[PDB]
Design a protein around this nucleic acid. Structure first.
Ligand SMILES: Nc1nc2c(ncn2[C@H]2C[C@H](O)[C@@H](COP(=O)(O)NP(=O)(O)OP(=O)(O)O)O2)c(=O)[nH]1
Ligand SMILES: [Mg+2]
Ligand SMILES: [Mg+2]
Length: 425
DNA sequence: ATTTTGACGCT
């Protein structure tokens, strides 16, 4: 009743760039704009592995994790942009810099949590309050929401349906009550329209966004109407939306835990979770997951928007599959040095930009025939931004995996260096 | 022989 808090305190947005790496290449190369295109890594093996796909190319069935030659079977006019290669490995600098452009714009509006190279959460609660105070009871015009969908509306062509649903929502709005959750979301969506306009104006990149009361709902909402649209998911829309939402569609439930929720409880959709008690869910999935599931299937989640715009770790990774696996000492040293050189470059620039220094070097490896993605992860001190020292320490720290009596055995199918434990400088 | 990352939980 009155004391059942409903998780309507906050206004949170998730902004995510549409086919991000492809848009970065399309800005740089106009010939790629408004075409089926994809971004790949490498080119010798099956034309390279696809990691980003324009929506034109998606209409042919091209997806991420597809080989480019297979994709070309689906889309013979597919255009391909290749990730930069440096020191014999993929170099993602162009996209990290494009990302920093986007993040710095979003930061002007509110405090953001960088959730990936192409997406950030925004806590808009304060900003919505300020804007409601500025409006002074003025109602919200549909002109202020040109790309906004209201999930679950209309009830009772695409743009036509969007405008119908928006009209229904705006007519139902109690603009006088500065404290109504639904009004707060609506004003949040006005600000998110402004944010996405600024992002497009100042970068050329288009994006989508979700507006709701928490991070999970904002993220789920963002995907409902991609590309180049934003979606308002209200508290009241949760029962219908969740009544047919596969559990795996909710962030963090797409893997083993989601599968066990399905198998143990004997359910399919998010909504069905509501029929279990908190204690029941805690019994099956632990106290934390259980509490979180009990509130999440009612649309409630409390995870804060962390004020963090920059990555907490800086890492360099390369796989060496099958017959390219590193089998000699010279090879492991040369590739550890290549990794350490790219890492050093990134870390020096990080220090100059962000006034901080990493203090811990993590070295991770895979050995051939190991089932696990990571076979060993060991850490050492990172005291100098010197690639030669970093590669020597990584070797010093992993060399006791070589069972050879000049050789390396088992051959290494992955090297991974990661700087962590940052400290102000 | 999708690859290259990065956050975060568990013990
Ligand atoms: N190297 C690498 N980069 C990746 C991988 N997966 C994604 N990226 C890169 C490429 C992606 O562009 C970017 C952000 O990933 P999304 O937001 O999940 N997909 P996108 O923005 O392309 O399309 P939309 O969001 O409109 O559905 O991260 C990967 O496995 N490896
Ligand atoms: Mg994206
Ligand atoms: Mg994303």
């Amino acid at each position: 009743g009155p004391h059942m808090a409903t998780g309507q305190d906050r206004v949170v947005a998730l902004v995510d760039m549409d086919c991000f790496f492809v848009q970065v290449e399309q800005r740089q190369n106009p010939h790629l704009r408004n075409k089926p295109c994809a971004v790949v890594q490498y080119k010798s093996w099956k034309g390279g592995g696809i990691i980003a796909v324009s929506y034109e190319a998606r209409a042919f069935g091209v997806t991420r994790s597809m080989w480019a030659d297979d994709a070309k079977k689906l889309c013979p006019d597919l255009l391909l942009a290749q990730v930069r290669e440096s020191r014999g490995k993929a170099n993602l600098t162009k996209y990290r810099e494009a990302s920093v452009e986007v993040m710095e714009i979003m930061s002007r509006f509110a405090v953001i949590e960088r959730a990936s190279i192409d997406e950030a959460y925004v806590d808009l609660t304060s900003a919505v309050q300020e804007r409601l105070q500025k409006l002074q009871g003025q109602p919200i015009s549909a002109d202020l929401l040109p790309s906004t969908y209201i999930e679950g509306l209309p009830q009772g062509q695409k743009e036509g349906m969007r405008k119908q649903g928006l009209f229904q929502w705006l007519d139902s709005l109690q603009i006088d009550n500065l404290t109504s959750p639904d009004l707060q979301l609506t004003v949040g969506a006005v600000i998110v329209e402004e944010m996405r306009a600024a992002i497009e104006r100042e970068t050329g990149f288009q994006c989508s966004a979700g507006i709701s009361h928490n991070k999970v709902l904002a993220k789920l909402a963002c995907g409902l109407n991609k590309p180049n649209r934003q979606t308002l998911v209200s508290h009241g829309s949760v029962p219908q939306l969740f009544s047919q939402m596969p559990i795996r569609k909710i962030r963090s439930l797409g893997g083993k835990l989601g599968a066990s929720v399905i198998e143990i409880l004997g359910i399919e959709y998010m909504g069905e979770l509501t029929q279990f008690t908190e204690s029941q869910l805690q019994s099956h999935f632990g106290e934390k997951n259980g509490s979180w599931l009990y509130a999440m299937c009612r649309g409630i989640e409390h995870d804060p928007v962390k004020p963090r715009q920059l990555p907490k770790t800086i890492g360099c990774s390369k796989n060496f599959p099958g017959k390219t696996a590193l089998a000699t000492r010279e090879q492991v040293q040369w590739w550890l040095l290549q990794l350490a050189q790219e890492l050093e470059e990134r870390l020096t620039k990080d220090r100059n930009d962000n006034d901080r220094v990493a203090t811990q070097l993590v070295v991770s490896i895979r050995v051939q025939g190991d089932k696990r993605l990571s076979s060993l992860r060991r850490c050492c001190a990172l005291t100098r931004y010197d690639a030669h020292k970093m590669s020597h320490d990584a070797f010093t720290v992993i060399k006791n995996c070589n069972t050879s009596g000049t050789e390396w055995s088992p051959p290494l199918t992955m090297l991974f260096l990661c700087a962590t434990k940052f400290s102000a400088s």
